[PDB]
Each structure stands twice: as structure tokens, then as C-alpha cells.
Ligand binder design. Structure first.
Ligand code: MG
Ligand code: MG
Ligand code: MG
Ligand code: MG
Ligand code: MG
Ligand code: MG
Ligand code: MG
Ligand code: MG
Ligand code: MG
Ligand code: MG
Ligand code: MG
Ligand code: MG
Ligand code: MG
Ligand code: MG
Ligand code: MG
Ligand code: MG
Ligand code: MG
Ligand code: MG
Ligand code: MG
Ligand code: MG
Ligand code: MG
Ligand code: MG
Ligand code: MG
Ligand code: MG
Ligand code: MG
Ligand code: MG
Ligand code: MG
Ligand code: MG
Ligand code: MG
Ligand code: MG
Ligand code: MG
Ligand code: MG
Ligand code: MG
Ligand code: MG
Ligand code: MG
Ligand code: MG
Ligand code: MG
Ligand code: MG
Ligand code: MG
Ligand code: MG
Ligand code: MG
Ligand code: MG
Ligand code: MG
Ligand code: MG
Ligand code: MG
Ligand code: MG
Ligand code: MG
Ligand code: MG
Ligand code: MG
Ligand code: MG
Ligand code: MG
Ligand code: MG
Ligand code: MG
Ligand code: MG
Ligand code: MG
Ligand code: MG
Ligand code: MG
Ligand code: MG
Ligand code: MG
Ligand code: MG
Ligand code: MG
Ligand code: ZN
Lengths: 248, 91
RNA sequence: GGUGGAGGUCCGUAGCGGUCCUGACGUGCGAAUCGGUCGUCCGACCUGGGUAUAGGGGCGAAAGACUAAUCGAACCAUCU
RNA sequence: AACUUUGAAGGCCGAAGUGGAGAAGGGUUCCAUGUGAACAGCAGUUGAACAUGGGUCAGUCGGUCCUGAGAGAUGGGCGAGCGCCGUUCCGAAGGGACGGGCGAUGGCCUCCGUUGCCCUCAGCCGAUCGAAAGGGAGUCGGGUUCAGAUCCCCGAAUCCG
RNA sequence: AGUUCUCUUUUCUUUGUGAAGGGCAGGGCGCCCUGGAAUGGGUUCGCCCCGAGAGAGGGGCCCGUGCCUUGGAAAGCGUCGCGGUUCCGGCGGCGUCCGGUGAGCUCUCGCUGGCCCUUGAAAAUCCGGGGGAGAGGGUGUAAAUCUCGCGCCGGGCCGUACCCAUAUCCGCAGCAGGUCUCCAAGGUGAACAGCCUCUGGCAUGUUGGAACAAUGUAGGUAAGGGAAGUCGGCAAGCCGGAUCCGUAACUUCGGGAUAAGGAUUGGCUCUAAGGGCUGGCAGCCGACUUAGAACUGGUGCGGACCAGGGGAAUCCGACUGUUUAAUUAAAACAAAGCAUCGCGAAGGCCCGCGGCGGGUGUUGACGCGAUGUGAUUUCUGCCCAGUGCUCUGAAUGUCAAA
RNA sequence: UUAGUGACGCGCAUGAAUGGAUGAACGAGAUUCCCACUGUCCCUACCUACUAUCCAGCGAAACCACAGCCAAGGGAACGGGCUUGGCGGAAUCAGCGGGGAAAGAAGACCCUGUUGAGCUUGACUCUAGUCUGGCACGGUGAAGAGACGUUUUUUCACUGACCCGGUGAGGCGGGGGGGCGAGCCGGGCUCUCGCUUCUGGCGCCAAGCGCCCGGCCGGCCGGGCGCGACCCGCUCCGGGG
RNA sequence: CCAAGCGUUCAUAGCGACGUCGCUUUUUGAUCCUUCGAUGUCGGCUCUUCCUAUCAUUGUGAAGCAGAAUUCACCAAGCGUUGGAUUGUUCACCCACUAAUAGGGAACGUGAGCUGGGUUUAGACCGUCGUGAGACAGGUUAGUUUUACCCUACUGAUGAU
């Protein structure tokens, strides 16, 4: 046989991200003395569309505490922030929408977005449009907090991780039918070469496990074991179940 | 005169895509193109620049809003929740 | 009753394409062309150049298609 | 002399042209004169053929410079090895500057330069390559040749240093 | 200059001003000042604007590719006429004038709007501002300084001919193929359609002469019938523009729809209506439309060109889109929609001989990755024995090396 | 009317996202009927252009054992040749498609070959990857359970190997010093804080103070140091290990 | 061919059991002789020719031949044997006309004569089968039809002894 489309995606080539017109990487501030002890003020200059991303991005500007400079930060835009607004990042920032605080100081039930997976990494979790994480509980003795991720999983993270109060803007995006193959063509022309997708049963056996046959049938169980070799791991990968999810 | 009986704004799609999808997208097409009152200046000028980005032509204030509506129910609920926790944080 | 001018909207030119005649031709004008008749013609549109992916490899809106007239595994030399 | 040239008729392309100019490609095919061996699927007094000689002139039109998708060194890593990966990532990555201080020299030797060292100050953080359609200061009128001209000449301007 | 048998104050050609500087029209302003507006007003084709300051006044700025001017009439062109070596940028006369109009075409500038789960480069390079370290002279032959006006010097290198395509390029060739662009006249007409013409171009496409048999290839016509032909109405044919009227089943209420079906269409002579400028009126301008009527021809008039045959159903695929370059354009592929599955980053999926390697990823579950079905509507029943997948494990048969 | 449509359904072998039923619009998709139209046809005719045709010039190619009239016979069972009969007359022109089992291409069908290749899997033998155990890198301390001060194991901790993230490696750890509260009989402590939250401004290149030094004539000119800006430390800061 | 029966009677007008002898190669088989360095594979259309096992017509014989209609048989292939709906069809079935609507061969006549509907490549759908790739004298849809100018034959045209 030949290498299947899934295998070919990992080699880069025509399968790399379309990053020509993106505005940069959306991150929190790099943690420094100001955010470790107090807070720093910043002003929202612009809220911009980022190609390939549902959520808008905020362009916040801070004062450099050591030099005569202005620092431009590219934050994830929490819903409700506006241009000209003051945002504050640090340990002693106040619990307002758009402020960046360590999750340790946030009370139980706080809604956050752009939450650091590890302390200092500048924000990794709950960055998709409309999403957020909640704060469940703190363990001051071990300095660790329990949060609920948008997928529903619960995670124990360091209390020192920073995060933005509120939910990511641009929510409810998936509530609109696309209605058109052309509109889906434009959605992915800004992201990557993944569209349109050709079904496995519609290929020949040479380039897919499901291909071939005088009838368009899978011919083998579609739940494939977790340890299947690359080029064989297609279909429902390591599925715990199949069918309609009935109930909770 | 009234030109269509029920299709309204989704009359631009003719017969395509099915009644239910055209019905469902009709709610969004109206909302995402409406001009909302600007809370900062009061002029009915708040208009959507891009998905999630709402701009006012009077005062030039841009707001991170919802995808198709100026502010979402989830976001409005969180603002009140974050307001209460703040009070119970500093009493 | 007007105004307005949306649309992967319709007739239709340029352009792009290539349904039927199973027409022409079939030691051709042509190792795929010609005529009429036809599809589409604001979009998933057409196209120049630059650039990337190289042979059990690429690339494929998927026909085992395309990859220099070569493709169910190119071409070149060697093993021979 | 059906086919060349001139004159006159009758026609056609009919501004999405059979018109006037370019890019890529060609490379002298361009222009003048001569030949009619061979070639131009008849002929030719003709030709983009053959022969002998000519023809392309710029601060201002392009390249040249910039960066684009991308390509590609060094440090480093890998590698039996030719080498490969990688492009800021495991790097002591600056050979610069207003100013000031010490000397050495000079010249319109008066006083100003130059130079060496010291003091002081210093993010850019990526060598380099990448477009004759992208970015990119500044040239237009008239005349002139067999063949060149926004390039030659005449006239009138402009940018940069 | 052409025509002139008749007519035609006729028909044709032609009737300039560069860059740069100055001045001024014109266009634009989300710029200022006064003032305070409901009996709300202003305003566009649409919009849209106002107590966060509308109307009304008076200003300011930006572009001015338009006109005048310096250039610049000396040049160029038209015409008439003289010379010369006659291969002279030869010499002279006259002229290069005055108005109108337009949903016109082409370009360009500007205003305002719609579309996006699409938001539509970077850098070289240039400029302004904030700050005020500093420097400059002591009342003068004044100094530092100057993005002001003149003046002085220089701008090296490489390309530049011509073809650019039914003959200069690629297809073995002067090959009916292929091959990226710019400018774009009159008439008819909705028109960059077709048909004819001017500017410009060409010589019929690698030959001519004479015939006009068959069979062809390409076009036409046909009495009466009208698919009886054939696998099949293949082929051809009918319909066709525009105006007026009229339009069903079904429908996802958008469509169906140019449904279907009728009438009209020439030429000529008129009538009515539809505006602008100046000083309910008067005067002068004007540009194409629409409607109506009479008359008229052998009923012919969208007279060429251009230009849908239609209806009732069944199957398939929702649609638009794509596909086997060179025998298959399809019901196949894709698609929105729907439903599963993996994954919280020391991760999922994948690449790589190799690594602190690489793509997704400038990413973070409204995400990325892997599948099936295939718009909407309605529904999607039973089976976990089989084969898969998955979860629990020292409770625990077999089980390698150490 | 072996066609079409509507019904029927013990359906060889229909059936529910291997999706079932439907249904507007759409289709160079398949099919049936009808109106209209017509040379598709009855049944053919005529006309035009370009050929063919003849001429001047110019001029290939495919193919070819020898060749080239038939009947039958026998024959490798369908003769151009051979046997027996029929018979035979130069050289040619335009057509034609009966024959040459005409040309074209070492049959693609079929079989054989101990010849292959693409693809599949419950074929045979392997293999990258992947899961898993052992050994090494590979360390420190506490306990718990054991065995004989050593040593096996479990758990919990450590950091220094090793790894990850961030930063222009910019304030880390400990102590000092100062402010708000608490409290025992004005001082010590429990113990917290380190000066920025209203506004779409500004914010560096030190003020001030203390101490020294220099040039010129106590006055002018010009410098240095310290505090301002706490002290000491061994991993830059975190996260793992 | 024999003749038990049928035919009211009566074997043989016309039929004919049980038996038996032949012919044909327009059916299918059986075989594998020729052809696999290729003889173009169904049907239709078109066109000519031939056979007779004669449907019609001419001339006749026999009937259970009154006439009419019909049946059997002889010489006999001269002349005919049609238009259509369904189907790719051969075959079949029906409608209609007719004197009659007979049956066949020519490489199952006839693809450098056509057509390409079917079969019989590559695309695709359904059912059954297979774990699968895939298969199916099971359905379905779309799928390139080359060359004559040579020899002969034939048709016509010059001509030759
Ligand atoms: Mg396929
Ligand atoms: Mg496979
Ligand atoms: Mg359209
Ligand atoms: Mg169309
Ligand atoms: Mg053909
Ligand atoms: Mg031919
Ligand atoms: Mg594309
Ligand atoms: Mg590879
Ligand atoms: Mg296939
Ligand atoms: Mg041209
Ligand atoms: Mg030219
Ligand atoms: Mg010649
Ligand atoms: Mg020449
Ligand atoms: Mg490299
Ligand atoms: Mg460069
Ligand atoms: Mg350039
Ligand atoms: Mg350029
Ligand atoms: Mg010059
Ligand atoms: Mg006003
Ligand atoms: Mg003059
Ligand atoms: Mg200043
Ligand atoms: Mg040139
Ligand atoms: Mg001609
Ligand atoms: Mg000629
Ligand atoms: Mg030619
Ligand atoms: Mg007729
Ligand atoms: Mg008639
Ligand atoms: Mg018929
Ligand atoms: Mg018939
Ligand atoms: Mg037709
Ligand atoms: Mg209809
Ligand atoms: Mg379709
Ligand atoms: Mg494609
Ligand atoms: Mg094809
Ligand atoms: Mg085709
Ligand atoms: Mg499924
Ligand atoms: Mg089910
Ligand atoms: Mg099971
Ligand atoms: Mg029929
Ligand atoms: Mg099924
Ligand atoms: Mg000749
Ligand atoms: Mg022979
Ligand atoms: Mg023959
Ligand atoms: Mg063979
Ligand atoms: Mg072979
Ligand atoms: Mg053997
Ligand atoms: Mg093999
Ligand atoms: Mg192979
Ligand atoms: Mg096995
Ligand atoms: Mg008896
Ligand atoms: Mg034998
Ligand atoms: Mg043979
Ligand atoms: Mg033959
Ligand atoms: Mg043959
Ligand atoms: Mg007889
Ligand atoms: Mg035959
Ligand atoms: Mg034949
Ligand atoms: Mg044939
Ligand atoms: Mg067929
Ligand atoms: Mg097939
Ligand atoms: Mg099965
Ligand atoms: Zn506002």
C-alpha cells in the first residue's frame, strides 16, 4: 500500500498552518516582580480580529518598570472589555473582568480564561472563544488549586498560576449553521489544509484500511486498538463505546 | 408593502439549505446586523466589525462581545457572579 | 404604492469547461485536433510568476487520478 | 511573371482586429546591399534562406536595495562518513556613538582636524539570499536614423550625494 | 478635398501645448468660531445627522491630473507660395476659432454603503512629535544655529535591436493546438452579442488552370402524411426580442415562472406629458423617452442579425461545486447538516536513520486530531452469542529475561 | 405494449446514519406518455460550396514467398497454385467494397510456466513502531516490615544528576529596619503589611544631603566618593525529580 | 414399413398404438482435426443469390368432394410471401391487411457495408456471497468502431488482334 492521508499530515509540507496574516501569539504577561507582589496597570488599545481564531484579541499596553518604554501585550479578549479600559495584572489586582490574578487568591466559583497550565507559562487553558474554567477549591498548605476545564475535566494546578477573570469573547460562534461548502471553504482557508475531507470508504485499498470493495463498506470493525501502527489507526481510535450517548 | 410572508432576511437564500436551517440562521442574521445602543455614548450605533468585535461609530469605543449578539447570556451572568464574589472577597 | 439592491440567484458575452452528433479527421492540421450543439460565467471563480512537497515517495472535492506524450509505483546509469 | 514592385479596381480582418505596443521564450531572426546553388512540399525577379557589412548610447526606464512564502551558514546537536537537523533554539553573538579625560601628530599651524587609549552610553534577538508584475527619490516636450532613442541632439526641469 | 445630369449654404479631413513653479476654478473635510434647536428640523438615488451642539451665518485645512500664466511660439500641425547644394530642423503669408450636450464609453479622484465562523503582507526607507542633556554672545566686523532663496561639483556598473505568434516562442516543421498582458472609433442594438463601415492591416492561409460524373464533407428546399423510421425523435426541425394581458399542480411559502396560453410590432403625419437658466407670470435654452391618434402598403413589419419548444409523470442525487489530460461528467466524489471516537500538553494524531529533532501549534476542548452518514421534513426498531474495541485486577490459571 | 404509471406482496435475496420513507427547487443524469414540429420515414428529388475528376508543376507512405479467373475433388476436414472439368487475348481509366480466411499488433479471452506484479487476510517467515520486565546512568534522610553492624523491600520526604517553563536570566532565601492592628504588667511580642484602582495624560538619562579634591582671584569655576537605592548568602527564577 | 384401433358401418378418405427402418444438418449435444506473431465476437438494417421438406398462384389426382368452404397427394421454386405496438433481441405475442402472409442456406451470408441497442475492459449503484481484497449465464447507468491508391471479382469507359 501507500502512505495514507493521516500519515502525510505530520510531515509539514501542504499541511502546515496558515500563519501569514496572524497577529502574533496571544499570551499573558511574563511574570515579574510587579505581578509577584503587587499589580501593574495596563490600558486596552485595540481589540482585533485574528485570522484562524474565533476569539478576538486585545492589545494591552503596560509601562516597563525598569526602562522608559511601552510594552504591547496581546491578550485573549475576555468578553465585556473595551478600548480605553484599564486592566491590572498581579497578585493584588482586584477581582474585575479582564484583570489577571493568580488563581490562588481567587475565591471559589470564579470564572477564568487563558489559565496557565503551569506557573509562569503565560496562559494555556480555556482560550477558545466563549470558553472558561471555574475555580473549585484551594489547598493553601500544598499551594494548589482545583479547577474545572471546559472539557469538564478537573485538574489540580499550582495556586501561583495566573489567569484572566471572565469568559473569552466571541462566544456562541458554533450556534450558526455554515449553510454552505463555500463558507466552510473560507473557514479553513484561514486555518490549514484540512478541507474538504474524503471518506475512507471512498478510496482504494492501497491508500486506506477502509478502502475498496464492490460495496462501500468498512468491512472490519471501525474501533481500532490504541497501539495500532501509524497507517492503521483509523476510525474510532481506542473507543470505550460507540453509538448514541443515551443519558448522562 | 410586506414583500415576504415569513422568510424575512433569509429570503436572500432562496429555496436552498432547507427550511429549518434557514429558520435557525434567521435569528442570527438579524442579531449580528442590528445596531445596538452604545452604553458609553447612547447613540444607536454599536455595530459588529468581526466575530466577537463590536465597534461604535460615534465614540469609537470597541468592545469584546459575543459572536452574533452584543453581549451573551453566559457573559452577562458571569459579570454579576464576579461582582458578588468581589464583594464577599473584600466584604 | 414606491424606494433599496441581497444572492456559492437566473438568461448570457470575455474567460474557464467539454454533453451530444456516437459529426469531421482517423498514414490527421493535431501522438487528442476541428464544427455545430452544449456546462458555468461574483465565486468552492479564472489566471501569470515566485515558493514548498520526490518515487513504496509526494499529491489526490478519490478517477488508482496526477507526478515532463511514461504511472496499480516515474525517469536515468549500474548490478547485467 | 498566376505568385515580385508600382498604379487602379473588387474584397476581407471590422476596435475582445488579420491594428499599435510589451512580459516569458528566441538570440541577430533586426537593417542595407547582393544571389537565386540548396531550403521556403507549385514558382519566385521574392523570403525570417544563403552571402558581405551594419545596428541596441540613460543619475531620472528596469536591474541594482527591501522584505514575502521560503531558502540557508555559524553556535549547538546528530552522524561510520560525504554530511544532515536546525534559524534563535544548549552562544562571552556589540568592533559602534554625542560627550568627557589623557597623550602622538599635523594644517588655511593662529586654533582647528586626525589618530591611539581610557571613561561613559548602547536591546533589537539573528550571517546571508529571496520579486525585470509587490515596496522603492528623481524627465518631460520637440527634432533626428537604413536600422536606436523618455537613452542621441535642441529646450526646459528635477532627485540624491 | 469629394460630389454637382438634378438636389445638397452639402459630405469628408483638420482645427496643440509637456514636466516643474505661481494664481484660480472645482471637489472633500469626523476642522474651527458665534449660537442654542419640538409646531423637531436638516438631508441623500439610498442613507444618514443633531443638547456629546442641528439648521443659519463667518472662517480654516487637504487634493486641485481641470483653466490661466512662466514654459511658449521661437516648437508642432494645416494650407498657400518662393528659393537652394538642391539628402537645407531652408525661407515667407494666413490659420491653429466660438459654443452645446449626455444613465454615453475608458480612466481616474472622492463620498457613502453592503459581505465575511473570509478581516484581506513585511521590510527597507522617510517624517513629525514629547523631552531638554547641551551649545551659543554680551550689545557687537555680534555668536552658535537655519528643513529659507540662490550659487558650486558629481551620479560609476549591467540590460536596451527585432518577433511576441494562423511564420522569429513550445509542440521534430512557416503545425487549424498551446502560450501572460496594455489602448480600443461610427451605425444598428440592452449590449465588449451578431451584421456593415473609418483608422491601421492583409492577400484567402505550403500551388494554379479546365470541368460540374458517381460517392462524399458542409449547407438548403420539398407536395400529401406527420415518428409509421430507429434500441431510443439520434438528427433536424418548431419556440425565440420587446410591449400589453394571463398564468395551474405542487411548494421548504423563497419559488414553480419567460409556467402554460393569447394579442401587438413596419412606414409616415401629428397630439400630450415628462426639465434647465434669467427677470401660479414672461423670455431664452435642451435631451432623450413614454403614451395616444390619423393615414398608409398585395397582412407585411423583433422582415437581415440576435434570439427558451412546451406539458404530465417515474428513478437517482437536495442544491452550487468536483472528477478518470487522451473512450466513462454520472446516480460517482465533495458538501452544509447529523452522529460517534481520542486528547488537559511528560498529551492526542502524525513525521523522522538520528537528537533537548519535527507538523498540528502564532494551537488549548466553541480546539486539534480520527471515522461514518450525507440539505430540509419524519423516523432511526430488536440483537453484546460471534468478531472487534474498551474497562477492573494480585483475587489470579499460563507466562521471558534478570 | 416483454415498455411506463397506480395497486397487490410468505419479499429466490427489501428495511432503518452498512441509514428507512419523503419531498420544493435544481440536473449536458436514467426512463414513459402527450401537444407542437418536422425528410426520421412512406420515397425519394433538386440546388449551392469544397473535394473527387482531367491538366501544369511537385510529389510520399502502408504492404509484398511467387502471385493473382472459376466448379468439384481430395487435402492440415473452406485452394490462386495440386487432380478432373469449365476455359485464357495487349495496355489501361473511373468506381466498388465479394474475396485476398487483406493490413495494423509475437491474442488482451482461455490454458500452461515450479515466470511476475498491484491488492487482501484467519497463509508461512519476518519487521519499524508500540506496551511491558530486568540491568546501567542513579544519588541523600527518615521511618515500617523483615533477614543475618550489614542487607532485601514498602511509604514518606530531600536535591545535586536528569527533565520542563519563563526572562533582555531585573529584586530569590534569610536577617535588619519602618507602618497598621492584637495584648501582659512606657517596653516586649503574637503577626501582618512594604506606599500604584476614577479619568483613553505624564513618568529614564537624580533631586537633596554628607564627606573629600582640584583650577583661578573668603569669592567664581570644576570634579570624586557615599547615602538616597538596607545587610549577608552557594545553585537566575519557578515546576518536576 | 406392419396394422390393434379410431373414423356410427368400414384398418389404410383422413388418422394410427405396440413395434420397427430411414433421411437432414436451419436444434442442441459429443469430439478437439484447422486457426491463439489474432479469420473482428449477437441482433437489426441493406442487397443478391440458391434449396424445397409447397403457404399462395398455374395444370392435376383423391375425399367421410352436393354447392361453398376445406383436407390428402402429384408435376412444380416461375412469381409472391406485407404494415405495425412490446422486446437488443433471435424467438415470441398480439393488432391490421392480404391470394398467401411457407420454411430454410450462402464462414449460424453480409462491422476496410453501416449501427452499437445487447454481450464482453477500465467509472458507478443495488441484492446475494466473502473477515477482506473481491466474485455473480443477477439487475442498472455511462463507456474511441481504424486503413483500400495494390491484386482479383464486379460495374461502367478507352481500346487491342
Ligand atoms: Mg473508487
Ligand atoms: Mg490496506
Ligand atoms: Mg450563479
Ligand atoms: Mg447561469
Ligand atoms: Mg466521431
Ligand atoms: Mg478519411
Ligand atoms: Mg482551490
Ligand atoms: Mg516521506
Ligand atoms: Mg477501481
Ligand atoms: Mg499586435
Ligand atoms: Mg511592430
Ligand atoms: Mg518549391
Ligand atoms: Mg527582414
Ligand atoms: Mg541546512
Ligand atoms: Mg537582496
Ligand atoms: Mg523590483
Ligand atoms: Mg516594482
Ligand atoms: Mg538629460
Ligand atoms: Mg450647523
Ligand atoms: Mg506657428
Ligand atoms: Mg521642544
Ligand atoms: Mg524595443
Ligand atoms: Mg477560399
Ligand atoms: Mg492564392
Ligand atoms: Mg501559415
Ligand atoms: Mg414534407
Ligand atoms: Mg405541407
Ligand atoms: Mg415505432
Ligand atoms: Mg420497424
Ligand atoms: Mg436533439
Ligand atoms: Mg413546470
Ligand atoms: Mg448532483
Ligand atoms: Mg481538483
Ligand atoms: Mg476520459
Ligand atoms: Mg467526455
Ligand atoms: Mg458509523
Ligand atoms: Mg439501528
Ligand atoms: Mg461483543
Ligand atoms: Mg412506445
Ligand atoms: Mg442495505
Ligand atoms: Mg497534375
Ligand atoms: Mg491463398
Ligand atoms: Mg474485400
Ligand atoms: Mg502469443
Ligand atoms: Mg502478448
Ligand atoms: Mg511443471
Ligand atoms: Mg509475487
Ligand atoms: Mg513493484
Ligand atoms: Mg499468520
Ligand atoms: Mg371399428
Ligand atoms: Mg485426438
Ligand atoms: Mg493469420
Ligand atoms: Mg476478413
Ligand atoms: Mg486480420
Ligand atoms: Mg417436390
Ligand atoms: Mg455470420
Ligand atoms: Mg466483409
Ligand atoms: Mg468495423
Ligand atoms: Mg452499448
Ligand atoms: Mg464495467
Ligand atoms: Mg458482508
Ligand atoms: Zn458609542
Amino acid at each position: 500500500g501507500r502512505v495514507i492521508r493521516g500519515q502525510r499530515k505530520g510531515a509539514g509540507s501542504v499541511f502546515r498552518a496558515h500563519v501569514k496574516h496572524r497577529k502574533g501569539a496571544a499570551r499573558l504577561r511574563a511574570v515579574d516582580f510587579a505581578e509577584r507582589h503587587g499589580y501593574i496597570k495596563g490600558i486596552v488599545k485595540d481589540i482585533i480580529h485574528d485570522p484562524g481564531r474565533g476569539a478576538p484579541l486585545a492589545k494591552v499596553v503596560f509601562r516597563d518598570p525598569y526602562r522608559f518604554k511601552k510594552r504591547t501585550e496581546l491578550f485573549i479578549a475576555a468578553e465585556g472589555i473595551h478600548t480605553g479600559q484599564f486592566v491590572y495584572c498581579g497578585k493584588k489586582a482586584q477581582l474585575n473582568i479582564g484583570n489577571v490574578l493568580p488563581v490562588g487568591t481567587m475565591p471559589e466559583g470564579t470564572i477564568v480564561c487563558c489559565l496557565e497550565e503551569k506557573p509562569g507559562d503565560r496562559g494555556k487553558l480555556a482560550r477558545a472563544s466563549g470558553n472558561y474554567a471555574t475555580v473549585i477549591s484551594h489547598n493553601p498548605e500544598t499551594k494548589k488549586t482545583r479547577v474545572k476545564l471546559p472539557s469538564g475535566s478537573k485538574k489540580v494546578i499550582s495556586s501561583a498560576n495566573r489567569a484572566v477573570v471572565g469568559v473569552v469573547a466571541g462566544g456562541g460562534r458554533i450556534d450558526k449553521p455554515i449553510l454552505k461548502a463555500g463558507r466552510a471553504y473560507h473557514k479553513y482557508k484561514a486555518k490549514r489544509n484540512c478541507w474538504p475531507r474524503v471518506r475512507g470508504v471512498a478510496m482504494n485499498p492501497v491508500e486506506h484500511p477502509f478502502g475498496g470493495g464492490n460495496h462501500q463498506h468498512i468491512g472490519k470493525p471501525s474501533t481500532i486498538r490504541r497501539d495500532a501502527p501509524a497507517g492503521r489507526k483509523v476510525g474510532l481510535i481506542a473507543a470505550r463505546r460507540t453509538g448514541r450517548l443515551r443519558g448522562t | 408593502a410586506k414583500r415576504t410572508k415569513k422568510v424575512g432576511i433569509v429570503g436572500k437564500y432562496g429555496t436552498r439549505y432547507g427550511a429549518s436551517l434557514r429558520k435557525m440562521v434567521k435569528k442570527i442574521e438579524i442579531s449580528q446586523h442590528a445596531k445596538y445602543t452604545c452604553s458609553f455614548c447612547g447613540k444607536t450605533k454599536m455595530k459588529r466589525r468581526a466575530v466577537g468585535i463590536w465597534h461604535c461609530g460615534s465614540c469609537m469605543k470597541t468592545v469584546a462581545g459575543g459572536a452574533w449578539t452584543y453581549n451573551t447570556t453566559s457573559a452577562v451572568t458571569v459579570k454579576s457572579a464576579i461582582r458578588r464574589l468581589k464583594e464577599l472577597k473584600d466584604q
